[PDB]
Design a protein around this ligand. Structure first.
Ligand code: HEC
Ligand code: HEC
Ligand SMILES: [Co+2]
Ligand SMILES: [Co+2]
Lengths: 106, 106
């Protein structure tokens, strides 16, 4: 899957958590988002075509996925503790990670 | 200033920027936010006095402030371009930084 693929996965599943018909769908969507974020971290965004892999732009790009994954894991723990409403509430705050990285590089 | 007074400065000047409609007003408010953020950036907070200065938790706390200062700086540059509304949208996007650090600390 490519960067555009990974972003569709993240967008589709973030909305699944918002609209989840049952609590089990939240964990399933978080799982898919974690995979998509780790895959996206290995891509080069088009607006950073010309920059070094050691550039601060690419550093901040990759770091954003690390941090996103951290907070997805926080949400998964809540869901794995059966605290599925708390997990759904946490998942809505993930939108800040999307918005922040997009500000820079989308 | 103390932590509570710095946090109030950040809180009020966000609304100053929302209320404003010209570049000088937005720049003035962002400069105040930046000074408030730098004032609070380096102090260990009460809940982590027993944590090492290089502990994962202190590291993430300090990065919260470093990253907030970075985006205030970016918004300030937009205001210095006369891009009032882009500067205002960036300032609204700062709320993600506020809530992220709060949820970690509280
Ligand atoms: C950086 C660390 C990012 C994080 C975190 C998220 N996204 Fe993203 N996204 C990023 C870039 C650089 C781009 C541009 C990709 C390109 O090839 O142009 C995107 C794009 C999207 C898109 C549009 C995809 C497309 O086909 O054009 C969507 C729908 C999207 N992103 C959604 C999304 C969501 C919901 C996120 C949080 C869960 C998220 N992204 C995180 C960089 C980064
Ligand atoms: C850590 C990296 C922080 C960032 C970034 C921001 N804040 Fe904060 N805030 C932080 C602490 C440790 C505290 C004190 C402990 C607590 O949880 O209250 C605060 C407190 C505030 C308050 C007062 C809370 C109240 O009940 O009135 C406000 C109003 C506040 N903070 C505002 C604020 C804003 C607007 C921020 C972004 C621009 C912001 N804070 C960032 C830690 C951190
Ligand atoms: Co965090
Ligand atoms: Co940033």
């Amino acid at each position: 899957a490519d960067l555009e693929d990974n972003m569709e996965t993240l967008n589709d599943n973030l909305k699944v958590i918002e609209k989840a018909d049952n609590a089990a769908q939240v964990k399933d969507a978080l799982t898919k988002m974690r995979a998509a974020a780790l895959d996206a971290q290995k891509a080069t965004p088009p607006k950073l075509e010309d920059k070094s892999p050691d550039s601060p732009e690419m550093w901040h790009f990759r770091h954003g996925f690390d941090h996103l994954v951290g907070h997805i894991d926080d949400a998964l723990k809540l869901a794995n503790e059966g605290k599925v409403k708390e997990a759904q509430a946490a998942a809505e705050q993930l939108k800040c990670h999307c918005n922040h990285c997009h500000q820079h590089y989308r």
